[PDB]
Design a binder for this molecule. Structure first.
Ligand SMILES: Nc1ncnc2c1ncn2[C@@H]1O[C@H](COP(=O)(O)OP(=O)(O)OP(=O)(O)O)[C@@H](O)[C@H]1O
Ligand SMILES: [Mg+2]
Lengths: 259, 309
Protein backbone atom coordinates (compact mmCIF):
# COMPACT_ATOMS: atom_id res chain seq x y z
CA UNK A 1 0.00 0.00 0.00
CA UNK A 2 2.75 2.44 0.97
CA UNK A 3 4.82 1.60 -2.12
CA UNK A 4 1.77 1.17 -4.38
CA UNK A 5 0.94 4.89 -4.28
CA UNK A 6 4.02 5.63 -6.41
CA UNK A 7 2.57 3.78 -9.41
CA UNK A 8 -0.75 5.63 -9.12
CA UNK A 9 1.01 9.00 -8.79
CA UNK A 10 3.20 8.28 -11.82
CA UNK A 11 0.21 7.14 -13.90
CA UNK A 12 -1.84 10.21 -12.94
CA UNK A 13 1.13 12.45 -13.87
CA UNK A 14 1.32 11.14 -17.45
CA UNK A 15 -9.22 11.48 -20.34
CA UNK A 16 -8.89 8.57 -17.91
CA UNK A 17 -7.47 10.67 -15.05
CA UNK A 18 -10.92 10.78 -13.43
CA UNK A 19 -10.95 7.02 -12.82
CA UNK A 20 -7.50 6.92 -11.19
CA UNK A 21 -8.27 10.08 -9.19
CA UNK A 22 -11.50 8.61 -7.85
CA UNK A 23 -9.88 5.27 -7.05
CA UNK A 24 -7.04 6.97 -5.16
CA UNK A 25 -9.45 9.22 -3.25
CA UNK A 26 -11.69 6.27 -2.31
CA UNK A 27 -8.80 3.93 -1.47
CA UNK A 28 -8.63 5.18 2.13
CA UNK A 29 2.73 10.52 8.18
CA UNK A 30 4.16 9.56 4.79
CA UNK A 31 2.05 12.30 3.18
CA UNK A 32 4.39 15.06 4.37
CA UNK A 33 7.45 13.19 3.11
CA UNK A 34 5.81 12.55 -0.27
CA UNK A 35 4.81 16.21 -0.60
CA UNK A 36 8.28 17.48 0.35
CA UNK A 37 9.89 15.93 -2.72
CA UNK A 38 7.12 17.29 -4.95
CA UNK A 39 7.57 20.78 -3.50
CA UNK A 40 11.33 20.62 -4.05
CA UNK A 41 10.80 19.44 -7.63
CA UNK A 42 8.37 22.22 -8.53
CA UNK A 43 10.62 24.83 -6.90
CA UNK A 44 13.65 23.56 -8.82
CA UNK A 45 11.65 23.56 -12.06
CA UNK A 46 10.93 27.28 -11.80
CA UNK A 47 14.42 28.03 -10.47
CA UNK A 48 16.00 26.44 -13.55
CA UNK A 49 13.29 27.71 -15.92
CA UNK A 50 14.96 31.13 -16.21
CA UNK A 51 10.71 25.52 -22.26
CA UNK A 52 9.33 21.97 -22.20
CA UNK A 53 8.89 21.75 -18.42
CA UNK A 54 5.27 22.98 -18.58
CA UNK A 55 3.65 19.50 -18.89
CA UNK A 56 5.68 18.23 -15.93
CA UNK A 57 4.65 21.20 -13.78
CA UNK A 58 0.99 20.81 -14.74
CA UNK A 59 1.06 17.08 -13.97
CA UNK A 60 2.77 17.70 -10.63
CA UNK A 61 0.18 20.29 -9.62
CA UNK A 62 -2.68 18.03 -10.71
CA UNK A 63 -1.38 15.04 -8.75
CA UNK A 64 -0.72 17.30 -5.75
CA UNK A 65 -4.30 18.58 -5.78
CA UNK A 66 -5.65 15.05 -6.27
CA UNK A 67 -3.70 13.66 -3.31
CA UNK A 68 -4.65 16.66 -1.16
CA UNK A 69 -8.37 16.29 -1.90
CA UNK A 70 -8.12 12.54 -1.21
CA UNK A 71 -8.09 13.30 2.54
CA UNK A 72 -2.28 22.98 10.66
CA UNK A 73 0.90 25.06 10.50
CA UNK A 74 2.54 24.43 7.10
CA UNK A 75 -0.57 25.25 5.05
CA UNK A 76 0.21 28.98 5.01
CA UNK A 77 3.86 28.40 4.07
CA UNK A 78 2.90 25.98 1.29
CA UNK A 79 0.25 28.35 -0.07
CA UNK A 80 2.65 31.31 -0.04
CA UNK A 81 5.38 29.28 -1.75
CA UNK A 82 2.96 28.06 -4.42
CA UNK A 83 1.66 31.57 -5.07
CA UNK A 84 5.18 33.00 -5.32
CA UNK A 85 6.41 30.25 -7.65
CA UNK A 86 3.30 30.62 -9.84
CA UNK A 87 3.57 34.42 -10.05
CA UNK A 88 7.32 34.29 -10.76
CA UNK A 89 6.78 32.09 -13.85
CA UNK A 90 5.03 34.87 -15.77
CA UNK A 91 6.84 34.17 -19.07
CA UNK A 92 5.28 30.79 -19.91
CA UNK A 93 1.72 32.10 -19.37
CA UNK A 94 0.03 28.70 -19.22
CA UNK A 95 -3.63 28.26 -18.29
CA UNK A 96 -3.43 24.62 -17.15
CA UNK A 97 -0.88 25.38 -14.43
CA UNK A 98 -2.93 28.39 -13.32
CA UNK A 99 -6.12 26.32 -13.12
CA UNK A 100 -4.41 23.57 -11.13
CA UNK A 101 -2.83 26.09 -8.75
CA UNK A 102 -6.15 27.87 -8.26
CA UNK A 103 -7.95 24.61 -7.47
CA UNK A 104 -5.23 23.54 -5.02
CA UNK A 105 -5.23 26.93 -3.28
CA UNK A 106 -9.02 26.90 -3.04
CA UNK A 107 -9.23 23.43 -1.50
CA UNK A 108 -6.33 24.18 0.87
CA UNK A 109 -7.96 27.41 2.05
CA UNK A 110 -11.37 25.78 2.44
CA UNK A 111 -9.93 22.89 4.44
CA UNK A 112 -9.21 25.14 7.44
CA UNK A 113 -11.64 27.37 9.37
CA UNK A 114 -11.79 31.18 9.81
CA UNK A 115 -10.02 31.14 13.18
CA UNK A 116 -6.45 32.18 12.34
CA UNK A 117 -4.44 35.13 10.99
CA UNK A 118 -3.06 33.65 7.77
CA UNK A 119 -1.33 36.02 5.36
CA UNK A 120 -4.09 37.53 3.21
CA UNK A 121 -2.01 40.17 1.40
CA UNK A 122 -0.29 37.57 -0.79
CA UNK A 123 -3.58 35.83 -1.63
CA UNK A 124 -5.28 39.13 -2.49
CA UNK A 125 -2.33 40.24 -4.62
CA UNK A 126 -2.25 36.93 -6.50
CA UNK A 127 -5.99 37.03 -7.11
CA UNK A 128 -5.90 40.60 -8.39
CA UNK A 129 -2.92 39.84 -10.64
CA UNK A 130 -4.59 36.80 -12.19
CA UNK A 131 -7.94 38.58 -12.56
CA UNK A 132 -6.38 41.59 -14.31
CA UNK A 133 -5.19 39.20 -17.06
CA UNK A 134 -8.20 36.89 -17.30
CA UNK A 135 -10.23 38.61 -20.03
CA UNK A 136 -9.09 36.60 -23.07
CA UNK A 137 -8.90 33.17 -21.45
CA UNK A 138 -10.60 29.81 -21.80
CA UNK A 139 -13.92 28.95 -20.20
CA UNK A 140 -12.27 26.44 -17.85
CA UNK A 141 -9.95 29.08 -16.37
CA UNK A 142 -12.83 31.52 -15.80
CA UNK A 143 -14.85 28.97 -13.82
CA UNK A 144 -11.83 28.06 -11.68
CA UNK A 145 -11.02 31.72 -11.02
CA UNK A 146 -14.60 32.50 -9.98
CA UNK A 147 -14.81 29.48 -7.67
CA UNK A 148 -11.45 30.41 -6.15
CA UNK A 149 -12.64 33.96 -5.52
CA UNK A 150 -15.72 32.52 -3.84
CA UNK A 151 -13.52 30.39 -1.58
CA UNK A 152 -11.44 33.38 -0.45
CA UNK A 153 -14.58 35.48 0.08
CA UNK A 154 -16.21 32.81 2.25
CA UNK A 155 -13.03 31.77 4.11
CA UNK A 156 -11.73 35.29 4.78
CA UNK A 157 -14.50 36.72 6.96
CA UNK A 158 -14.24 39.94 9.01
CA UNK A 159 -10.76 40.47 7.52
CA UNK A 160 -11.38 41.70 3.97
CA UNK A 161 -10.35 45.38 3.75
CA UNK A 162 -12.64 47.95 2.18
CA UNK A 163 -10.07 48.54 -0.58
CA UNK A 164 -10.49 45.02 -2.00
CA UNK A 165 -14.29 45.19 -2.22
CA UNK A 166 -14.09 48.80 -3.44
CA UNK A 167 -11.77 47.87 -6.31
CA UNK A 168 -13.81 44.74 -7.09
CA UNK A 169 -16.95 46.74 -7.96
CA UNK A 170 -15.65 49.40 -10.36
CA UNK A 171 -15.59 49.62 -14.18
CA UNK A 172 -11.90 48.66 -14.27
CA UNK A 173 -12.74 45.35 -12.55
CA UNK A 174 -12.64 42.42 -14.97
CA UNK A 175 -15.73 40.90 -13.30
CA UNK A 176 -18.01 43.67 -14.60
CA UNK A 177 -17.02 42.97 -18.21
CA UNK A 178 -16.85 39.22 -17.58
CA UNK A 179 -20.53 39.15 -16.60
CA UNK A 180 -21.41 39.73 -20.29
CA UNK A 181 -20.28 36.23 -21.32
CA UNK A 182 -22.79 34.27 -23.41
CA UNK A 183 -22.30 31.10 -21.33
CA UNK A 184 -24.75 30.34 -18.52
CA UNK A 185 -22.37 28.65 -16.07
CA UNK A 186 -20.18 31.77 -15.92
CA UNK A 187 -23.21 33.95 -15.17
CA UNK A 188 -24.36 31.53 -12.47
CA UNK A 189 -20.99 31.51 -10.72
CA UNK A 190 -20.80 35.31 -11.05
CA UNK A 191 -24.17 35.64 -9.33
CA UNK A 192 -22.93 33.26 -6.64
CA UNK A 193 -19.88 35.48 -6.10
CA UNK A 194 -22.13 38.53 -5.78
CA UNK A 195 -24.37 36.85 -3.21
CA UNK A 196 -21.33 35.63 -1.26
CA UNK A 197 -19.75 39.09 -1.19
CA UNK A 198 -23.15 40.50 -0.18
CA UNK A 199 -23.72 37.95 2.63
CA UNK A 200 -21.17 39.25 5.18
CA UNK A 201 -21.91 40.55 8.68
CA UNK A 202 -19.65 43.59 9.14
CA UNK A 203 -21.50 46.77 8.16
CA UNK A 204 -18.42 49.02 7.60
CA UNK A 205 -17.11 46.69 4.88
CA UNK A 206 -20.54 45.91 3.39
CA UNK A 207 -21.73 49.53 3.20
CA UNK A 208 -19.13 50.39 0.56
CA UNK A 209 -20.15 47.43 -1.62
CA UNK A 210 -23.83 48.29 -1.21
CA UNK A 211 -23.14 51.90 -2.17
CA UNK A 212 -21.13 50.84 -5.21
CA UNK A 213 -23.94 48.57 -6.42
CA UNK A 214 -26.52 51.31 -5.86
CA UNK A 215 -24.34 53.80 -7.72
CA UNK A 216 -23.97 51.49 -10.70
CA UNK A 217 -27.73 50.94 -10.72
CA UNK A 218 -28.34 54.70 -10.58
CA UNK A 219 -25.95 55.25 -13.48
CA UNK A 220 -27.81 52.65 -15.55
CA UNK A 221 -31.20 54.22 -14.83
CA UNK A 222 -29.83 57.69 -15.61
CA UNK A 223 -28.50 56.48 -18.96
CA UNK A 224 -31.84 54.84 -19.78
CA UNK A 225 -33.72 58.01 -18.83
CA UNK A 226 -31.46 60.21 -20.95
CA UNK A 227 -31.88 57.80 -23.87
CA UNK A 228 -35.49 59.00 -24.22
CA UNK A 229 -34.93 62.76 -23.62
CA UNK A 230 -35.98 62.94 -19.98
CA UNK A 231 -34.04 64.41 -17.04
CA UNK A 232 -32.37 61.97 -14.67
CA UNK A 233 -33.35 61.42 -11.03
CA UNK A 234 -32.23 59.43 -7.97
CA UNK A 235 -29.52 61.83 -6.81
CA UNK A 236 -29.46 60.53 -3.21
CA UNK A 237 -27.68 57.25 -4.04
CA UNK A 238 -25.23 58.44 -6.69
CA UNK A 239 -21.56 57.48 -6.59
CA UNK A 240 -18.41 59.33 -7.61
CA UNK A 241 -16.93 56.30 -9.41
CA UNK A 242 -19.70 56.55 -12.04
CA UNK A 243 -19.63 60.28 -12.79
CA UNK A 244 -19.75 59.72 -16.56
CA UNK A 245 -20.14 56.50 -18.54
CA UNK A 246 -21.64 55.30 -21.83
CA UNK A 247 -23.90 52.24 -21.51
CA UNK A 248 -26.18 50.86 -24.21
CA UNK A 249 -29.92 50.52 -23.62
CA UNK A 250 -29.77 46.71 -23.68
CA UNK A 251 -26.65 46.67 -21.51
CA UNK A 252 -28.19 49.12 -19.03
CA UNK A 253 -31.39 47.07 -18.73
CA UNK A 254 -29.43 43.84 -18.26
CA UNK A 255 -27.24 45.45 -15.59
CA UNK A 256 -30.27 46.83 -13.72
CA UNK A 257 -31.91 43.40 -13.69
CA UNK A 258 -28.67 41.74 -12.58
CA UNK A 259 -28.14 44.14 -9.67
CA UNK B 1 -90.25 26.66 -39.86
CA UNK B 2 -88.77 26.21 -43.35
CA UNK B 3 -85.86 28.63 -42.74
CA UNK B 4 -83.37 25.95 -41.69
CA UNK B 5 -79.67 26.53 -42.51
CA UNK B 6 -78.19 24.73 -45.54
CA UNK B 7 -75.57 22.58 -43.77
CA UNK B 8 -72.69 22.72 -41.29
CA UNK B 9 -69.44 21.58 -42.92
CA UNK B 10 -67.68 19.34 -40.40
CA UNK B 11 -64.50 19.34 -42.51
CA UNK B 12 -62.95 21.27 -45.37
CA UNK B 13 -62.96 20.19 -49.03
CA UNK B 14 -60.14 20.38 -51.56
CA UNK B 15 -60.96 23.08 -54.12
CA UNK B 16 -57.90 22.50 -56.33
CA UNK B 17 -56.32 19.06 -56.66
CA UNK B 18 -52.58 18.42 -56.70
CA UNK B 19 -52.69 18.24 -60.51
CA UNK B 20 -53.89 21.89 -60.49
CA UNK B 21 -57.43 21.14 -61.65
CA UNK B 22 -60.63 22.95 -60.72
CA UNK B 23 -62.98 20.90 -58.51
CA UNK B 24 -66.71 21.64 -58.84
CA UNK B 25 -67.89 20.28 -55.50
CA UNK B 26 -68.27 23.35 -53.24
CA UNK B 27 -71.31 24.81 -55.04
CA UNK B 28 -73.70 22.64 -53.01
CA UNK B 29 -72.55 24.47 -49.86
CA UNK B 30 -73.16 27.95 -51.33
CA UNK B 31 -76.36 29.99 -51.53
CA UNK B 32 -77.68 32.92 -53.59
CA UNK B 33 -76.73 35.56 -51.00
CA UNK B 34 -74.54 38.61 -51.57
CA UNK B 35 -71.92 40.44 -49.46
CA UNK B 36 -69.55 37.51 -48.97
CA UNK B 37 -66.00 37.61 -47.57
CA UNK B 38 -63.04 35.54 -48.79
CA UNK B 39 -59.64 35.06 -47.12
CA UNK B 40 -56.33 33.73 -48.43
CA UNK B 41 -52.83 33.16 -47.06
CA UNK B 42 -49.35 32.82 -48.58
CA UNK B 43 -46.59 31.26 -46.51
CA UNK B 44 -43.50 29.08 -46.27
CA UNK B 45 -43.11 25.39 -45.41
CA UNK B 46 -43.55 25.56 -41.63
CA UNK B 47 -45.20 28.91 -40.94
CA UNK B 48 -48.51 27.46 -39.74
CA UNK B 49 -51.09 28.61 -42.27
CA UNK B 50 -53.36 25.61 -41.67
CA UNK B 51 -53.25 26.14 -37.90
CA UNK B 52 -54.11 29.83 -38.30
CA UNK B 53 -57.05 29.09 -40.59
CA UNK B 54 -58.33 26.39 -38.25
CA UNK B 55 -58.08 28.63 -35.18
CA UNK B 56 -59.75 31.52 -37.04
CA UNK B 57 -62.57 29.69 -38.87
CA UNK B 58 -64.09 26.93 -36.72
CA UNK B 59 -61.57 25.90 -34.07
CA UNK B 60 -60.31 26.90 -30.63
CA UNK B 61 -56.88 26.44 -29.00
CA UNK B 62 -58.40 23.98 -26.52
CA UNK B 63 -59.43 21.58 -29.30
CA UNK B 64 -57.00 18.86 -30.32
CA UNK B 65 -54.93 19.32 -33.48
CA UNK B 66 -56.38 16.08 -34.87
CA UNK B 67 -59.86 17.62 -35.21
CA UNK B 68 -58.75 20.77 -37.05
CA UNK B 69 -60.84 21.60 -40.12
CA UNK B 70 -57.53 22.16 -41.96
CA UNK B 71 -55.05 19.27 -41.94
CA UNK B 72 -52.04 20.49 -39.97
CA UNK B 73 -48.51 19.11 -39.89
CA UNK B 74 -47.62 16.20 -37.63
CA UNK B 75 -44.52 15.60 -35.52
CA UNK B 76 -43.85 12.28 -37.27
CA UNK B 77 -43.87 14.10 -40.64
CA UNK B 78 -41.55 17.00 -39.74
CA UNK B 79 -38.57 14.62 -39.79
CA UNK B 80 -38.70 14.21 -43.58
CA UNK B 81 -39.36 17.93 -44.11
CA UNK B 82 -42.33 17.43 -46.42
CA UNK B 83 -45.38 19.56 -47.16
CA UNK B 84 -48.78 18.80 -45.63
CA UNK B 85 -51.25 20.87 -47.67
CA UNK B 86 -51.39 20.50 -51.46
CA UNK B 87 -53.34 22.68 -53.86
CA UNK B 88 -56.03 24.96 -52.45
CA UNK B 89 -58.61 24.17 -49.77
CA UNK B 90 -62.15 25.49 -49.31
CA UNK B 91 -64.39 25.83 -46.25
CA UNK B 92 -67.25 28.17 -45.33
CA UNK B 93 -68.07 28.97 -41.71
CA UNK B 94 -71.56 29.37 -40.25
CA UNK B 95 -71.26 33.16 -40.66
CA UNK B 96 -71.18 32.94 -44.48
CA UNK B 97 -67.41 33.59 -44.54
CA UNK B 98 -65.29 31.75 -47.11
CA UNK B 99 -61.77 30.62 -46.18
CA UNK B 100 -58.99 29.45 -48.49
CA UNK B 101 -55.83 27.56 -47.49
CA UNK B 102 -53.00 27.15 -50.00
CA UNK B 103 -49.79 25.14 -50.28
CA UNK B 104 -46.35 26.53 -49.36
CA UNK B 105 -44.49 28.63 -51.93
CA UNK B 106 -40.98 27.68 -53.09
CA UNK B 107 -41.21 24.53 -50.98
CA UNK B 108 -38.14 22.29 -51.51
CA UNK B 109 -40.26 19.23 -50.67
CA UNK B 110 -42.47 19.80 -53.72
CA UNK B 111 -39.40 20.07 -55.95
CA UNK B 112 -37.85 16.91 -54.48
CA UNK B 113 -41.09 14.98 -54.98
CA UNK B 114 -41.37 16.29 -58.54
CA UNK B 115 -37.83 15.16 -59.40
CA UNK B 116 -38.83 11.49 -59.06
CA UNK B 117 -41.77 11.71 -61.46
CA UNK B 118 -40.81 22.03 -69.40
CA UNK B 119 -37.11 22.89 -69.17
CA UNK B 120 -36.48 22.50 -65.43
CA UNK B 121 -38.84 21.79 -62.51
CA UNK B 122 -37.66 24.99 -60.78
CA UNK B 123 -39.43 27.17 -63.34
CA UNK B 124 -42.49 24.92 -63.05
CA UNK B 125 -42.69 25.42 -59.29
CA UNK B 126 -42.06 29.15 -59.71
CA UNK B 127 -44.91 29.57 -62.20
CA UNK B 128 -47.18 27.49 -59.97
CA UNK B 129 -46.52 29.82 -57.04
CA UNK B 130 -47.06 32.87 -59.26
CA UNK B 131 -50.37 31.46 -60.53
CA UNK B 132 -51.67 30.72 -57.03
CA UNK B 133 -50.60 34.17 -55.81
CA UNK B 134 -52.26 35.90 -58.77
CA UNK B 135 -55.50 33.95 -58.33
CA UNK B 136 -55.60 34.81 -54.63
CA UNK B 137 -54.83 38.48 -55.27
CA UNK B 138 -57.59 38.51 -57.90
CA UNK B 139 -60.50 36.85 -56.07
CA UNK B 140 -59.79 37.69 -52.42
CA UNK B 141 -60.70 40.54 -50.07
CA UNK B 142 -57.91 40.23 -47.48
CA UNK B 143 -54.71 38.18 -47.69
CA UNK B 144 -52.82 37.31 -44.50
CA UNK B 145 -49.06 36.75 -44.72
CA UNK B 146 -47.66 34.32 -42.14
CA UNK B 147 -43.98 34.26 -41.22
CA UNK B 148 -41.65 32.47 -38.80
CA UNK B 149 -38.64 34.81 -38.54
CA UNK B 150 -38.66 38.49 -39.41
CA UNK B 151 -36.39 40.14 -42.01
CA UNK B 152 -36.90 37.51 -44.70
CA UNK B 153 -36.17 39.98 -47.56
CA UNK B 154 -37.70 37.50 -50.04
CA UNK B 155 -41.46 37.43 -49.40
CA UNK B 156 -41.85 41.13 -50.19
CA UNK B 157 -40.15 40.72 -53.57
CA UNK B 158 -42.46 37.82 -54.43
CA UNK B 159 -45.55 39.78 -53.41
CA UNK B 160 -44.44 42.82 -55.42
CA UNK B 161 -43.76 40.76 -58.55
CA UNK B 162 -47.00 38.79 -58.13
CA UNK B 163 -49.14 41.92 -58.61
CA UNK B 164 -47.80 42.42 -62.16
CA UNK B 165 -48.86 38.96 -63.40
CA UNK B 166 -52.56 39.06 -62.50
CA UNK B 167 -55.08 38.50 -65.32
CA UNK B 168 -57.11 41.67 -64.78
CA UNK B 169 -59.55 51.78 -61.24
CA UNK B 170 -58.21 48.35 -60.27
CA UNK B 171 -58.93 46.04 -57.34
CA UNK B 172 -56.19 45.55 -54.75
CA UNK B 173 -56.93 43.18 -51.85
CA UNK B 174 -55.76 44.06 -48.36
CA UNK B 175 -52.51 42.50 -47.15
CA UNK B 176 -52.24 41.56 -43.46
CA UNK B 177 -48.83 40.76 -41.97
CA UNK B 178 -48.66 38.11 -39.25
CA UNK B 179 -45.61 36.98 -37.28
CA UNK B 180 -46.06 33.43 -36.01
CA UNK B 181 -43.93 31.87 -33.27
CA UNK B 182 -42.90 35.31 -32.03
CA UNK B 183 -40.45 35.46 -29.12
CA UNK B 184 -40.41 37.71 -26.06
CA UNK B 185 -37.95 40.16 -27.64
CA UNK B 186 -40.44 40.88 -30.45
CA UNK B 187 -42.87 42.32 -27.87
CA UNK B 188 -40.77 45.43 -27.21
CA UNK B 189 -41.41 49.05 -28.25
CA UNK B 190 -37.98 49.40 -29.88
CA UNK B 191 -38.34 46.15 -31.82
CA UNK B 192 -41.89 47.08 -32.83
CA UNK B 193 -40.78 50.47 -34.15
CA UNK B 194 -37.86 48.90 -36.03
CA UNK B 195 -40.17 46.32 -37.63
CA UNK B 196 -42.65 49.01 -38.67
CA UNK B 197 -39.92 51.18 -40.20
CA UNK B 198 -38.37 48.22 -42.03
CA UNK B 199 -41.73 47.17 -43.48
CA UNK B 200 -42.44 50.75 -44.56
CA UNK B 201 -39.09 51.08 -46.32
CA UNK B 202 -39.43 47.64 -47.95
CA UNK B 203 -42.97 48.26 -49.25
CA UNK B 204 -42.64 51.85 -50.47
CA UNK B 205 -44.18 51.05 -53.88
CA UNK B 206 -46.31 48.05 -52.92
CA UNK B 207 -49.34 49.79 -54.52
CA UNK B 208 -51.51 47.68 -52.20
CA UNK B 209 -53.54 48.52 -49.09
CA UNK B 210 -51.35 47.75 -46.08
CA UNK B 211 -51.89 50.73 -43.74
CA UNK B 212 -54.72 52.13 -41.65
CA UNK B 213 -56.24 48.70 -41.02
CA UNK B 214 -55.86 46.10 -38.26
CA UNK B 215 -54.04 48.35 -35.82
CA UNK B 216 -52.40 46.30 -33.08
CA UNK B 217 -52.19 49.35 -30.82
CA UNK B 218 -55.96 49.87 -30.93
CA UNK B 219 -56.43 46.29 -29.65
CA UNK B 220 -54.97 47.23 -26.23
CA UNK B 221 -51.98 44.96 -26.86
CA UNK B 222 -49.60 47.67 -25.58
CA UNK B 223 -51.50 49.61 -22.88
CA UNK B 224 -48.69 52.11 -22.28
CA UNK B 225 -47.44 52.69 -25.83
CA UNK B 226 -48.82 56.01 -27.16
CA UNK B 227 -50.25 56.15 -30.69
CA UNK B 228 -47.72 58.86 -31.64
CA UNK B 229 -44.73 56.59 -30.96
CA UNK B 230 -45.11 54.85 -34.33
CA UNK B 231 -44.76 56.95 -37.48
CA UNK B 232 -47.21 54.73 -39.39
CA UNK B 233 -48.75 51.71 -37.66
CA UNK B 234 -49.05 49.15 -40.46
CA UNK B 235 -51.25 46.04 -40.33
CA UNK B 236 -48.90 43.79 -38.34
CA UNK B 237 -49.89 41.20 -35.75
CA UNK B 238 -47.92 38.82 -33.53
CA UNK B 239 -48.72 35.28 -32.38
CA UNK B 240 -46.49 33.57 -29.77
CA UNK B 241 -45.96 29.90 -28.92
CA UNK B 242 -48.77 27.75 -27.56
CA UNK B 243 -49.54 27.85 -23.84
CA UNK B 244 -34.67 32.37 -15.20
CA UNK B 245 -33.37 33.50 -11.81
CA UNK B 246 -33.10 37.09 -13.06
CA UNK B 247 -36.78 37.36 -14.10
CA UNK B 248 -38.77 34.48 -12.56
CA UNK B 249 -42.41 34.27 -13.59
CA UNK B 250 -42.12 36.93 -16.32
CA UNK B 251 -43.59 35.91 -19.68
CA UNK B 252 -43.04 39.15 -21.60
CA UNK B 253 -46.10 38.80 -23.85
CA UNK B 254 -49.86 38.23 -23.53
CA UNK B 255 -51.51 34.83 -23.67
CA UNK B 256 -51.64 32.98 -26.98
CA UNK B 257 -55.42 32.53 -26.75
CA UNK B 258 -56.02 36.25 -26.18
CA UNK B 259 -54.00 37.25 -29.25
CA UNK B 260 -55.63 34.54 -31.37
CA UNK B 261 -59.11 35.73 -30.37
CA UNK B 262 -58.18 39.36 -31.05
CA UNK B 263 -56.88 38.49 -34.52
CA UNK B 264 -60.03 36.50 -35.26
CA UNK B 265 -62.26 39.40 -34.22
CA UNK B 266 -60.28 41.90 -36.31
CA UNK B 267 -60.29 39.67 -39.40
CA UNK B 268 -64.00 38.83 -39.11
CA UNK B 269 -64.85 42.55 -39.36
CA UNK B 270 -62.72 43.30 -42.42
CA UNK B 271 -64.15 45.47 -45.18
CA UNK B 272 -65.85 43.78 -48.15
CA UNK B 273 -65.53 46.06 -51.19
CA UNK B 274 -67.00 45.13 -54.55
CA UNK B 275 -64.59 42.93 -56.49
CA UNK B 276 -66.02 44.04 -59.85
CA UNK B 277 -68.54 46.59 -61.13
CA UNK B 278 -71.44 44.19 -60.41
CA UNK B 279 -72.96 42.59 -57.32
CA UNK B 280 -71.74 39.01 -56.92
CA UNK B 281 -73.38 36.18 -54.99
CA UNK B 282 -71.82 33.01 -53.57
CA UNK B 283 -72.52 31.02 -56.74
CA UNK B 284 -71.61 34.00 -58.91
CA UNK B 285 -68.34 34.41 -57.03
CA UNK B 286 -67.56 30.72 -57.51
CA UNK B 287 -68.20 30.98 -61.25
CA UNK B 288 -66.09 34.14 -61.49
CA UNK B 289 -63.24 32.46 -59.62
CA UNK B 290 -63.41 29.42 -61.90
CA UNK B 291 -63.31 31.61 -65.01
CA UNK B 292 -60.40 33.63 -63.61
CA UNK B 293 -58.50 30.44 -62.83
CA UNK B 294 -59.09 29.05 -66.32
CA UNK B 295 -57.91 32.32 -67.85
CA UNK B 296 -54.79 32.61 -65.70
CA UNK B 297 -53.88 28.98 -66.45
CA UNK B 298 -53.59 29.57 -70.22
CA UNK B 299 -52.20 33.09 -69.92
CA UNK B 300 -49.31 34.81 -71.75
CA UNK B 301 -47.41 36.89 -69.18
CA UNK B 302 -46.72 33.85 -67.00
CA UNK B 303 -45.39 31.88 -69.98
CA UNK B 304 -43.11 34.76 -70.96
CA UNK B 305 -41.79 35.09 -67.40
CA UNK B 306 -41.13 31.35 -67.20
CA UNK B 307 -39.34 31.37 -70.56
CA UNK B 308 -37.17 34.34 -69.56
CA UNK B 309 -35.70 32.27 -66.71
N1 LIG C 1 -47.94 29.20 -32.77
C1 LIG C 1 -47.48 27.95 -32.85
N2 LIG C 1 -46.98 27.38 -31.74
C2 LIG C 1 -46.52 26.12 -31.81
N3 LIG C 1 -46.49 25.31 -32.86
C3 LIG C 1 -46.99 25.90 -33.95
C4 LIG C 1 -47.50 27.19 -34.03
N4 LIG C 1 -47.94 27.46 -35.32
C5 LIG C 1 -47.68 26.35 -35.97
N5 LIG C 1 -47.11 25.37 -35.21
C6 LIG C 1 -46.72 24.03 -35.65
O1 LIG C 1 -45.91 24.17 -36.81
C7 LIG C 1 -46.42 23.33 -37.87
C8 LIG C 1 -47.09 24.19 -38.91
O2 LIG C 1 -47.67 23.34 -39.92
P1 LIG C 1 -49.16 23.54 -40.40
O3 LIG C 1 -49.68 22.31 -41.04
O4 LIG C 1 -49.99 24.06 -39.23
O5 LIG C 1 -49.04 24.72 -41.45
P2 LIG C 1 -47.95 25.24 -42.49
O6 LIG C 1 -46.67 25.55 -41.83
O7 LIG C 1 -48.58 26.38 -43.28
O8 LIG C 1 -47.82 24.00 -43.47
P3 LIG C 1 -48.34 23.53 -44.90
O9 LIG C 1 -48.13 24.75 -45.80
O10 LIG C 1 -47.36 22.42 -45.32
O11 LIG C 1 -49.75 23.08 -44.82
C9 LIG C 1 -47.32 22.32 -37.18
O12 LIG C 1 -46.57 21.20 -36.71
C10 LIG C 1 -47.91 23.14 -36.03
O13 LIG C 1 -48.28 22.31 -34.93
MG1 LIG D 1 -49.60 23.28 -42.82
Amino acid sequence: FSTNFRDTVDILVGSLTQQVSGWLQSLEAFSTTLLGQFLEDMEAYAEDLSSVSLPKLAALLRVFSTVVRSIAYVTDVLYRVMRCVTAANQVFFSEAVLTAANECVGVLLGSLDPSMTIHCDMVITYGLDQLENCQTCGTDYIISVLNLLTLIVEQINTKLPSSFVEKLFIPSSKLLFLRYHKEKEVVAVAHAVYQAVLSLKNIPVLETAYKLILGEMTCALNNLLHSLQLPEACSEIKHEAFKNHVFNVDNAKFVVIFD
Amino acid sequence: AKLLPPERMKHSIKLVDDQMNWCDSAIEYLLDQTDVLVVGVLGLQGTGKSMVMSLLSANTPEEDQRTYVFRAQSAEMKERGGNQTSGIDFFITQERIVFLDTQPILSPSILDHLINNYNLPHTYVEMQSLQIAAFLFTVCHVVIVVQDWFTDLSLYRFLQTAEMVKPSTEYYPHLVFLQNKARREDFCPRKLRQMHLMIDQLMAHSHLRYKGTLSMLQCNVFPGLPPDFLDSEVNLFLVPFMDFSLLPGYRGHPSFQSLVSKLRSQVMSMARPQLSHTILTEKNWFHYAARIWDGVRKSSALAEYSRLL
